[PDB]
Design an enzyme around this catalytic site. Sequence first.
Site, PDB file in Angstrom:
ATOM      1  N   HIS A   6       0.777  -1.520   0.242  1.00  0.00           N
ATOM      2  CA  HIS A   6       0.340   0.319  -0.065  1.00  0.00           C
ATOM      3  C   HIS A   6       0.905   1.436   0.024  1.00  0.00           C
ATOM      4  O   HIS A   6      -0.132   2.427  -0.558  1.00  0.00           O
ATOM      5  CB  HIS A   6      -1.148  -0.185   1.451  1.00  0.00           C
ATOM      6  CG  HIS A   6      -2.228  -1.356   0.923  1.00  0.00           C
ATOM      7  ND1 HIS A   6      -2.183  -1.635   0.184  1.00  0.00           N
ATOM      8  CD2 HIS A   6      -2.586  -1.899   1.849  1.00  0.00           C
ATOM      9  CE1 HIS A   6      -3.503  -2.542  -0.023  1.00  0.00           C
ATOM     10  NE2 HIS A   6      -3.705  -2.724   1.479  1.00  0.00           N
ATOM     11  N   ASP A  59      -3.677 -11.533  -0.995  1.00  0.00           N
ATOM     12  CA  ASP A  59      -4.313 -10.138  -0.214  1.00  0.00           C
ATOM     13  C   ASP A  59      -5.904 -10.117   0.065  1.00  0.00           C
ATOM     14  O   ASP A  59      -6.102 -10.089  -1.083  1.00  0.00           O
ATOM     15  CB  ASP A  59      -3.365  -9.049  -0.188  1.00  0.00           C
ATOM     16  CG  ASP A  59      -3.625  -8.726   1.615  1.00  0.00           C
ATOM     17  OD1 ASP A  59      -4.553  -7.968   1.502  1.00  0.00           O
ATOM     18  OD2 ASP A  59      -2.882  -8.623   2.294  1.00  0.00           O
ATOM     19  N   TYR A  71      -4.023 -10.327  10.481  1.00  0.00           N
ATOM     20  CA  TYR A  71      -4.233  -9.751  11.763  1.00  0.00           C
ATOM     21  C   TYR A  71      -4.914 -10.835  12.906  1.00  0.00           C
ATOM     22  O   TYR A  71      -4.613 -10.726  14.019  1.00  0.00           O
ATOM     23  CB  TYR A  71      -4.885  -8.463  11.444  1.00  0.00           C
ATOM     24  CG  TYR A  71      -4.972  -8.299  10.190  1.00  0.00           C
ATOM     25  CD1 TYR A  71      -3.619  -6.944  10.497  1.00  0.00           C
ATOM     26  CD2 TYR A  71      -5.036  -8.094   9.225  1.00  0.00           C
ATOM     27  CE1 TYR A  71      -3.331  -6.599  10.031  1.00  0.00           C
ATOM     28  CE2 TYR A  71      -4.400  -6.910   8.168  1.00  0.00           C
ATOM     29  CZ  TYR A  71      -3.628  -6.221   8.520  1.00  0.00           C
ATOM     30  OH  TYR A  71      -3.353  -5.376   7.379  1.00  0.00           O
TER      31      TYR A  71
HETATM   32  C1  LIG Z   1     -11.519  -6.308  11.341  1.00  0.00           C
HETATM   33  O1  LIG Z   1      -9.638  -6.589  11.716  1.00  0.00           O
HETATM   34  C2  LIG Z   1      -9.321  -5.336  11.477  1.00  0.00           C
HETATM   35  C3  LIG Z   1      -7.634  -5.446  11.530  1.00  0.00           C
HETATM   36  C4  LIG Z   1      -6.575  -4.814  11.642  1.00  0.00           C
HETATM   37  C5  LIG Z   1      -6.630  -3.601  10.225  1.00  0.00           C
HETATM   38  C6  LIG Z   1      -5.803  -2.937   9.939  1.00  0.00           C
HETATM   39  N1  LIG Z   1      -6.008  -1.897   8.564  1.00  0.00           N
HETATM   40  C7  LIG Z   1      -6.855  -0.455   8.841  1.00  0.00           C
HETATM   41  C8  LIG Z   1      -6.944   0.177   7.897  1.00  0.00           C
HETATM   42  C9  LIG Z   1      -6.507  -1.183   7.088  1.00  0.00           C
HETATM   43  C10 LIG Z   1      -6.315  -0.747   5.269  1.00  0.00           C
HETATM   44  C11 LIG Z   1      -5.235  -2.434   4.687  1.00  0.00           C
HETATM   45  C12 LIG Z   1      -5.105  -2.981   5.536  1.00  0.00           C
HETATM   46  C13 LIG Z   1      -3.956  -4.529   4.723  1.00  0.00           C
HETATM   47  O2  LIG Z   1      -3.729  -5.530   5.302  1.00  0.00           O
HETATM   48  N2  LIG Z   1      -3.909  -4.646   4.024  1.00  0.00           N
HETATM   49  O3  LIG Z   1      -2.787  -5.325   3.180  1.00  0.00           O
HETATM   50  C14 LIG Z   1      -5.213  -3.016   6.889  1.00  0.00           C
HETATM   51  C15 LIG Z   1      -5.754  -2.056   7.568  1.00  0.00           C
HETATM   52  C16 LIG Z   1      -8.268  -3.492   9.694  1.00  0.00           C
HETATM   53  C17 LIG Z   1      -9.259  -4.397  10.990  1.00  0.00           C
HETATM   54  K   LIG Z   2      -4.495  -8.671  -3.645  1.00  0.00           K
HETATM   55 ZN   LIG Z   3      -4.698  -6.511   3.500  1.00  0.00          ZN
END
Ligand SMILES: COc1ccc(Cn2ccc3ccc(C(=O)NO)cc32)cc1
Ligand SMILES: [K+]
Ligand SMILES: [Zn+2]
Length: 397
Positions: free
Chosen positions: A141, A176, A311
């Site tokens: 990103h 992803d 996550y």
């Molecule tokens: C539903 O649980 C979650 C846990 C972590 C996140 C973190 N997060 C917030 C905005 C965002 C944008 C992209 C990504 C990502 O993994 N890109 O590859 C993670 C993000 C959100 C929800």
């Molecule tokens: K992707």
């Molecule tokens: Zn992601």
Amino acid sequence: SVGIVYGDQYRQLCCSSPKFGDRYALVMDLINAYKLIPELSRVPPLQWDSPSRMYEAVTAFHSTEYVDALKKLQMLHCEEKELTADDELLMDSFSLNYDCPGFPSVFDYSLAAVQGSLAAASALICRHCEVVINWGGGWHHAKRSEASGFCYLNDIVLAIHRLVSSQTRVLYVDLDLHHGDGVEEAFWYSPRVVTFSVHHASPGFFPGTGTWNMIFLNGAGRGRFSAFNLPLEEGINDLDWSNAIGPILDSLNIVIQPSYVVVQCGADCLATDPHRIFRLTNFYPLSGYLYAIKKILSWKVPTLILGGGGYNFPDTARLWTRVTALTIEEVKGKKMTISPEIPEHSYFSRYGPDFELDIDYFPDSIQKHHRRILEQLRNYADLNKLIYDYDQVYQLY
Ligand SMILES: COc1ccc(Cn2ccc3ccc(C(=O)NO)cc32)cc1
Ligand SMILES: [K+]
Ligand SMILES: [Zn+2]
Ligand SMILES: [K+]
């Protein structure tokens, strides 16, 4: 052979971020609990002769004033006092805020992934490794002058720039949950790097790109038709996913005939990811991830495997361990037996309460996408005067 990026300083640095915590340690230790390291070649993170050298390597893509800003942000968080109003302004114009906040090691942390994915590229180029793995990397990103989605430095873009500059074509494959916007955007005007992301897309969902737009953008200039995207609805399972990307992956190979393949292998498509969007697993009787990886690897093209989202740290570890082991088997040829039970190691209790290697889960639009993508491929090939049998490709659907 097969390479993994790691090192003591590296592990410590991939583990100092507030959002990914000790995921990198859980991953590399599960790899190590499973006696997989002896079968692997350790690829050390690249170091630079001087600040100027580091700086020239990073600004091959990232703007200098952005690298300055990120490094000023680390300094500012290593001090106790808070940011001046002027400093807040500076950081905001680089989106160094919100889901991209500063922390005391944020520049060192971002640089490390760059260091690993650059060494990985180099180990492919000098042909020491057929495949290299970097679970510390995959931050798709990050933009030229902007942090985004907790990505500050785009290690992929830079690892890729290094591959094409060694005619050289690179296929980028982005598994992803989120659209790899940054990587896609970086090679928007380039035909020698074809990008392809499969992901969830729906209104208000990050980042917003990789789908129908106010029709389908697919590259500009000589780069026209070279950015591919497959946006899927929520709830998709292993087999439906597998069947959705499978033909696209095969056809990109046959048509493009890539010199390298770079795979962002983001783990947030898992059923057990807090996102709870996709229903992908890590099962191996079949995991959509494993299907795709093994497909890509049957191509015998030198390949970079990268991390990304994920996550639910123990379950990301459960997938990336299986990927690691799969890669070892599909490259060296020797069978990899993995115990269904998590072996004892320092993080063993994180995998409770059942300590199984499998994650704990019980299991038309796409054809209009397949047809659109086949047309785009044909337009790509025609624009780039590539020879290929249309029917042979068409049959894959
Ligand atoms: C539903 O649980 C979650 C846990 C972590 C996140 C973190 N997060 C917030 C905005 C965002 C944008 C992209 C990504 C990502 O993994 N890109 O590859 C993670 C993000 C959100 C929800
Ligand atoms: K992707
Ligand atoms: Zn992601
Ligand atoms: K492109």
